[PDB]
Amino acid sequence: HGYVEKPESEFKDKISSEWIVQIDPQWKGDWDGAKGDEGLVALYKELKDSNNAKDIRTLLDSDTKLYGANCGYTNPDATPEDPPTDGTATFSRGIVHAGPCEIWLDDKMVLQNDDCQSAYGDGTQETISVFKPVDYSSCASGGCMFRFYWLALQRLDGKTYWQVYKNCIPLS
Amino acid sequence: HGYVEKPESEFKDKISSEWIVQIDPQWKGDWDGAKGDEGLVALYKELKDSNNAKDIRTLLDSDTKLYGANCGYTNPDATPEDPPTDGTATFSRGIVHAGPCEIWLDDKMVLQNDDCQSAYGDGTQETISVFKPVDYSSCASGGCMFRFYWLALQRLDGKTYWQVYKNCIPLSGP
């Protein structure tokens, strides 16, 4: 759960920290047989390779009925805001689910990791997750759309689920 | 997870300890706000009272799309077997989810609890769950269908779900 807080996510309607969808894994594999967070991540990395996938955006953007609405619950129509000046993005809390995440500035993939839980925080909810480094130089011209993608790999009584989080924030 | 082991569940095809369905709570209430297993059970009891429900079978039988196929993955047309002789039924493992369960022999409800995790075992998977007491006397003349229902109350990241478990086992008379 959570949303990007810097830059500040905006909502048209209700504020929500929830995933946009929560579905069965769509890449065929032995998801249920993986040993814990490290197992889910390791399997993800293995399936990423054999599906020939360079990033999660391509997958998550390919079908909004299966992978959820563009921008999730966030509002791309919001008043654009100034990019951060410190080369970071900040989540609204600590990431406590394993899985890959990505930041794009328009068509430029500026940050990517197979397990953002370990890369950008300490796995506790208390420690704010800080996405860094982020180069916002491509935005200084005429702005950009900041897009955040996160695929959390989750378990409920032995069964693995994919949770999809999407945020969009316009920058000037 | 699990299935009734005594009497012995027979499976239509694949053997499965899984629920037949897993769905949003269908009774409106503050399911996500309940504090743990104790809270989930306490909330069930309140909504049971206000929905005027005497059992879970009526609800779970009312819509077999929403609440899953009759008999789950089990075969009610298996060779009938002799009822247990010791006034008990045995689960295939220990129950480790909170929530109500009940046992019917045809239209007779012979066991019910709002929280079978605490009533019929110790909350560990290792300790086998044993439903008791069960009176099988109605099966003597002409056999009976044994039905097990269980509504498990589960959380996944602050969101509550209902898991529905159903087993049917045919028992013989003399």
Ligand SMILES: [Cu+2]
């Ligand atoms: Cu979450």
Ligand SMILES: [Cu+2]
């Ligand atoms: Cu289970």
